Structure formats: C-alpha cells, structure tokens
C-alpha cells in the first residue's frame, strides 16, 4: 500500500490491497478436511472430505456434489496463507490443482502475472489493462523481483540487471500456443529494452520521432513489416505469429542499445496458397487491395475484390478488429525507416502482386495429349511483366520443363495437374524468400559499428502443440521443444544444485535434463528420424511407404521412445508415436518425402535468375551457385551448395540457436490462453491443464518437490515475512539479501530441519509447513491459556468491588422492607397513613 504508488493506478492488476490480503490469509481453514478432487466433467473441482471408504473417499462438492472417489483422486489443499501467491512454488503443496487453481484465483482477480518457479506465468486479459503503463515501466526499473509483484518488466529488467552485474549475456525465451498471446509480450518487451535504456541524444526529439532514421524505431519498426508479411489471422488469435523469431539485442559496453539481429524460423509457407473457412492469409494482401495508395492497384494490375484471387480468399477476407488502409501506411512507412531502397519498395510491392496472379493462371489439356498447355496469356502477361520476365519464355518453362537427367538437359512434359502445383510451388518459394530477403536487409540496417559487449536474445516461437493430426511440421515444432525444455531442466539443475551447496545441504542429485536424452537423440542422431528422413530423400523412387519401413526396421523394438500409433480416439491415421516428455505424439509420414525435398521448377528459377527486376533476380542466386554441384540426374544437391533435405537446415539453424541460448542466462516466459471462447476473467480447466504440461510449469513443479517442494526467492522471502521477528529478519535481509532471509529464520519455535538454503533460494518442505504450524499451534496454547487465566482472574477481581459496594446498599434494602412488614398492620401506623396527608 505505502509501497505501491509507482504503480498505484495498476496497482490492483498487480497487487492487492493489504487488508484484502490479510482478509483472505487469515481466515478459518480445516486441513484434515478441506480437499481438491477428480472430477469426470470439470477437471478438478474443490470440495470437502465427508467419509473415508478404506481407500475410498467421499466428498462434497463446491456446488454441491457428492463423489466417492479413490485415495489418489483427493489432493490436498493449501492453508489460505497460500492464497493468490506470486510464486506457486513457494506453496507446501505442489500438486496439479493447486496450480491450476492459484492461477485461476489471481485471474478472476485480473491478476495475469504469476510466477511459477523460475517461469513467469501470463494469462491472456481478453480486454485492456494499465499494466503497460509508462508508470509500471519506471517502476519495475531497478528492482529484483522480491522488491515487486509478478510481472514481466520484472524478468526483463533483471536481465538488463544481470547484464550488466555479471557481464553475461541473457535470453528470453516466451511460448505458447497459437492464442496466448505472445508477439503482443515479446514487442512489450522489446519496447521496454528500447526504452530503458536508449538515447541515441540527437534521434531522441520530437522531430519526426520514431520514423525512419533511428533504431530504437528501426528496431521497432521491425515488427509492423514482419507482421504484414509473417502475420494472420488465425481462427484463434486475429494477429497470429505465423513464424518464430529471435533478436539480439546488443547492448553496449556502457549498458546503452547498440545493435540488434533477427532471425526467423518455419514460416507457414501454406497461407501463401490456402487458407482455413474461418482463416485468412498474409495481412499485405488484403492491406494492398484495401485501396488507401490507389496506385498500387493500378500498379500490381489487381482489383480491391479479393475474390479475384484465389489463393487469398479461400478462407475469409476481412476482419472486424482490423484496419487494413491503416496498416497499409504503417508497413509503408516502416519499410521505408527500415531504409529500403523504393525500388526494392517497389519489388516487394510488385513481388507479392505476381503471387496473387499466378494462383489465377491457368491450363488446359493439349487435344489428343494429356499435356498442358496454357489457356491463356492474359495473366501471364501481369505476372510476367511484374516479375520482370518474358509471358512465353515463361510459360513454357512451366509446361515444358527442361531438365537434366544424365550428363545432358532433357525436355520433360508435364500435366495440368503438374502445373497447377508446380506454379503454387513457386508462389510459396518467392514469397518465403523474399521474407528471408526482407529480414536480412533489416538486419542489415540494424547493423551498426558501434562496440557490443553483450546482447539480451528474446526468443519467440510455438510451444509444444498435439493435433489429432501430426506432421512433419509439428515434428520439427516439438522437436524444437522438446530440446528447449531440456535446457531449462538442466538450468534448473545447475541452480538447485548451487543452493544445496550455498546452504550446505547435502542433496545428490542427477541432470534434470538426462531424461530427456533418449528423445533427442531418436530424432538428431545419426540412424534417427531425420537422417532416414533425408537419406531417403536421396533415392529418386522412394516412397513415404518406403520412408516408413526404414523407420521401423531400424528403430522398432530397437528403441523404446520409438512406437506404432494408436490409430483411435481423436486421430486420423496410422505410422509412428513418439514419447516427447509433453507426451505421446502420434505422427503421420504423408508428404514428408516431398516437403522435405522442396521440389522446384528449375527452367523457371533460372528466369527469375536472370530477371530485369535485381531483387528477385536475387533472392534466387543460392540456388544458381549450387546447380553446379547437381549437375546429373540422381546423386547429391550439396555439392553445389543445394540443399537435400527439408530439414537438413532447421536442424543447423536450430543448433545455431541452441548454441547461442547457451552463452546465455536463460529468463523464462510462459504465455497462457484462458479460454477458446475469447473471455475475460475466465478459464477453462482442462484447455489451462493441458499448456501447463507442454509448458514446463508442471515439470518444473515436479523438479521442485523432489524433495523440497516450495522454493522460497529471498527477496519474495523477505518483504513478506520480515515482520515476524521484525527486528532481526529485517536486519537479515536488508543486511544480505540471502543472508538476511538465513539470519531471519534465527528465530520462530519453528522445525530448522524443514528447510534449506541455497544460493538462490531456500527451500521448504510442506507437510513441512504443516509441520511448522503444529509446533505454533502448541505456542499459542501457551500464549492464549495463559492470557486467558488472568483475563478470568481479573474478571472476578472487578465482581469483588461491585459485591463489597453492594454491602450496604442490600442490607438498607434488606433491614428496610421488614420494617414495613411490621408496621403496615400497627393502628398507630395506619393512622399515621391516612393521616401523613393532610400534613404541610
């Protein structure tokens, strides 16, 4: 309350009030009693213990149900000290429930941050907050995370703390699913970084602020392009990340911003030529037909109705929440800062004009031939004329692809089937590329020469996702998880580790990460998935069928991670499930051999090769180079720097990246979506249950009550329980931020077994605090018995001054009335009566 001012607006978002507090810890609570349960329609609902069947329980529900579930279907549920706790972890009961259920609390309360562990839990709002108020950002500036309540400047200030307080480089790494909310944090966090820590003294005036011309915008800037290009609507998020990201952000030697780098990862390369019912595609699209630069129309040689374009209305054209003539200017404009050249302006704009025509070209069948022929140069024309290419030459290199199988080049023949795909097969390749191209001149830019002596990396790609349907995308998705939760384990390990060893506890204890070797290596390792994935690739008349058996002649019964699906349930076919640590990943081999081989029309390539538009002509170089290497039919693309698997990259680009988390202090991030039904202060049970697992935030949990459960942050350990011997843990605790929470525990009749100490943290046993509370419960019947008797004692002290007051009073009472008793029926007094009146 005295504390929060900084905030004070967002102050209940962040906090509560401390009678609020006060209110809801010190309360009535019935351990023995009070329990979390099973429950066949809600995943876990609240509810007290009624009976006890043996290994069979009975319990009332909070809504009232009665159910009598198993032993193990009952858990335990925290004292109300434990209410609406920052760090889960610090609870005494590390179950399933009361994670899901903290979380849930402090929602309904509008509280979206909440740390479990190491994590930073957040909770999609559905609706606006103060939060991102330019008060907070000062606020968490400076401050460890024990200083201030769970928010996500909290991480990204610490960083920059750590940065600079141990000269080591950090990283950020936010996931979640498609709907959490993600980009939205790690722009927030982005921002922040600039902020914070900028000045570039001359761009800093307001004078054309934040266009192009610094980077701080440059840096910002970034996104909205990215977003218009990488972004859509999905049927879950109406911005959706279509693709993963990573910048570093390199701070200088004084600690000001000095440079940064993207790098992107799996683009949804698909929305280019599809799209879902209640989907839609890239953003650019339906800005450019919004008609706010008219021009561009004309330009492109396209129309404002979208329904011109296959390839872009398949599924939904506009949205409510979004304006397209808007945006139109801001990527406009942020091209420009981003210092493109108009021509290049221009080539982006033409580029992705073509792709809209060439999903509106269009064959026919040969007379006679089951060849295709074109049906048409009026499309062709806009395309070519756009690309910077000639309709014909063109047109044929489509249908009369010219190939070389041998030591020769031979004119094949292909089908209006064949075309049709191979078209959309280059409309995705340009795209992409250009993408790629786009990211790299803006890395160009953001290219300074300027001293770094460390870089804060922020990580933004897809959590672990199951589908009823898995394919080679989700793959390469999980695996990338699968291999990112290692190293947190692992992290984990290493601090745990650190503790024990500060405290002098003596607890042994193996990698976290171990566990999830046997995983990795199933898929990176040499006989694994990938490799029998791209070796394959090399055999001009496999088959996925034949993919498929190599799989399993070599892993099956071989290995243990490694299984045959299940066919039923939720799933859609058969070939191979996988034990990711999330789960069991039921993966369909259908399309892999040719994902994986990106197969390209050459004769094609080789006009973009030579195109009158430089840009294009240069997104396609790479390829030109290694052509040489691939020179006859069957063999090895990579011996002219081609690529031979879909994969083979991924793979080299995603050690690149493991390799640069690791000369790095991980900071984690873990972005929560509440509901499908897009509500706030709401969650559904089962959908939260579900992330929580693929997350990391249960196997953190896990970790952590191995053991020693709850796992106190000395700040977070201070603040909150100075106040018990005041004096002595305050002193502790301002006096050595560990060794003051150490200094504190001095005193209380408190089990000094329970606990145990360690360089970050100290750690808590449950039915610990249950223990400790019993040896408080005995301390008070001495406090109160004895507070009691002398209250007693006193109350009868004050009942002998009334009674001895009283002495007289009674007897002038007593004497008084038998007096009369006597009298009344005296001659002489009955006179006196009727007589006492006619007196004066």
Same mark, same amino acid.
């Given at each position: 309350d005295a504390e929060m001012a900084a905030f004070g607006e967002a102050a209940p978002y962040l906090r509560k009030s401390e009678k609020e507090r006060i209110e809801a810890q010190n309360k009535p609570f019935d351990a023995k009693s009070s329990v979390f349960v099973v429950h066949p329609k809600q995943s876990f609902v609240k509810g007290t213990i009624q009976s006890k069947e043996g290994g069979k329980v009975t319990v009332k529900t909070e809504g009232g149900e009665t159910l009598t579930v198993k032993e193990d279907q009952v858990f335990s549920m925290n004292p109300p000290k434990y209410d609406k706790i920052e760090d889960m972890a610090m609870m005494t009961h590390l179950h399933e429930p009361a994670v899901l259920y903290n979380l849930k609390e402090r929602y309904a309360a509008w509280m979206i941050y909440t740390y479990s562990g190491l994590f930073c839990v957040t909770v999609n709002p559905y609706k606006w907050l103060p939060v991102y108020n330019p008060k907070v950002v000062l606020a968490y500036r400076g401050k460890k995370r024990q200083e201030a309540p769970p928010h996500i400047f909290s991480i990204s200030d610490n960083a920059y703390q750590f940065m600079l307080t141990d000269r080591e480089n950090q990283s950020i790494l936010i996931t979640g699913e498609s709907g959490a909310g993600k980009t939205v944090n790690t722009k927030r966090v982005i921002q922040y970084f600039a902020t914070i820590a900028a000045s570039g003294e001359k761009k800093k005036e307001e004078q054309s602020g934040k266009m192009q011309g610094t980077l701080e915008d440059q840096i910002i800037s970034a996104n909205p392009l990215l977003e218009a290009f990488g972004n859509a609507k999905t049927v879950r998020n109406d911005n959706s990340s279509r693709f993963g990201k990573f910048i570093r952000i390199h701070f200088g030697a004084t600690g000001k911003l000095a440079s940064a780098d993207i790098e992107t990862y799996l683009?949804?390369?698909s929305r280019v030529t599809f799209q879902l019912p209640a989907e839609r595609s890239y953003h650019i699209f339906y800005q450019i037909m919004s008609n706010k630069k008219p021009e561009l129309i004309d330009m492109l040689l396209i129309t404002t109705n979208p329904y011109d374009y296959h390839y872009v209305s398949e599924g939904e054209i506009t949205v409510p929440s979004i304006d397209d003539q808007e945006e139109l200017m801001a990527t406009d404009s942020a091209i420009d800062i981003l210092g493109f050249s108009a021509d290049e302006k221009t080539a982006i704009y033409k580029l992705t004009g073509a792709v809209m025509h060439y999903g509106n070209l269009k064959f026919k069948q040969k007379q006679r031939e089951e060849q295709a022929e074109p049906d048409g140069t009026e499309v062709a024309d806009k395309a070519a004329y756009l690309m910077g290419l000639n309709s014909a030459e063109l047109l044929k290199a489509l249908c009369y692809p010219r190939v070389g199988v041998g030591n020769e080049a031979v004119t094949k023949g292909e089908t209006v089937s064949e075309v049709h795909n191979s078209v959309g097969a280059l409309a995705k390749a340009v795209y992409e590329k250009m993408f790629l191209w786009m990211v790299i001149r803006i890395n160009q830019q953001l290219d300074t020469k300027q001293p770094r002596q460390y870089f804060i990396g922020v990580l933004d790609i897809a959590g672990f996702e199951i589908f009823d349907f898995n394919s080679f995308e989700q793959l390469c998705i999980n695996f990338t998880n699968e291999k990112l939760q290692q190293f947190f384990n692992h992290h984990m390990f290493v601090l745990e580790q650190e503790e024990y060893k500060k405290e002098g506890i003596e607890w042994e204890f193996i990698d976290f990460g171990m566990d999830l070797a046997a995983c990795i290596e199933l898929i990176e390792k040499p006989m694994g998935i990938f490799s029998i994935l791209e070796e394959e690739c090399m055999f001009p008349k496999a088959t996925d069928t034949s993919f498929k058996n190599k799989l399993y002649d070599e892993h099956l019964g071989k290995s243990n991670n490694f299984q045959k699906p299940k066919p039923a349930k939720g799933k859609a076919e058969a070939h191979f499930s996988l034990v990711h640590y999330a789960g069991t990943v039921d993966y369909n081999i259908s399309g892999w051999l040719e994902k994986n081989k990106d197969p390209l029309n050459e004769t094609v390539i080789g006009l973009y090769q030579k195109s009158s538009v430089k840009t294009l002509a240069l997104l396609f170089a790479t390829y030109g180079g290694e052509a040489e290497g691939g020179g006859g039919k069957k063999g090895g693309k990579k011996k002219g720097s081609s690529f031979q698997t879909v994969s083979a990259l991924f793979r080299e680009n995603l050690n690149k990246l493991m390799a640069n988390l690791r000369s790095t202090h991980p900071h984690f991030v873990r972005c929560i979506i509440p509901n499908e039904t897009k509500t706030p202060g709401a969650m559904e049970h089962e959908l939260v249950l579900h992330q929580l697992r693929c997350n990391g935030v249960l196997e953190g949990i896990r970790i952590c009550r191995k053991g020693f459960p709850s796992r106190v942050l000395y700040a977070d350990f201070k603040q909150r329980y100075? #106040? @018990?011997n005041a004096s002595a843990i305050p002193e502790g605790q301002f006096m050595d931020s560990k060794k003051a929470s150490e200094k504190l @525990? /001095? /005193? /209380?009749? #408190?089990?000094?077994?329970q606990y145990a100490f360690g360089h970050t943290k100290v750690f808590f046993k449950a039915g610990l605090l249950g223990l400790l509370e019993e040896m408080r419960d005995d301390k008070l019947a001495e406090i109160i018995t004895a507070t009691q008797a002398r209250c007693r004692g006193f109350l009868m002290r004050v009942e002998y001054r009334a009674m001895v007051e009283r002495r007289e009073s009674i007897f002038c009472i007593q004497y008084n009335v038998r007096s009369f008793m006597n009298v009344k029926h005296w001659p002489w007094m009955k006179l006196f009566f009727k007589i006492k009146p006619l007196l004066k």
């Open positions: 683009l949804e390369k100075r #106040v @018990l @525990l /001095g /005193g /209380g009749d #408190v089990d000094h077994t």
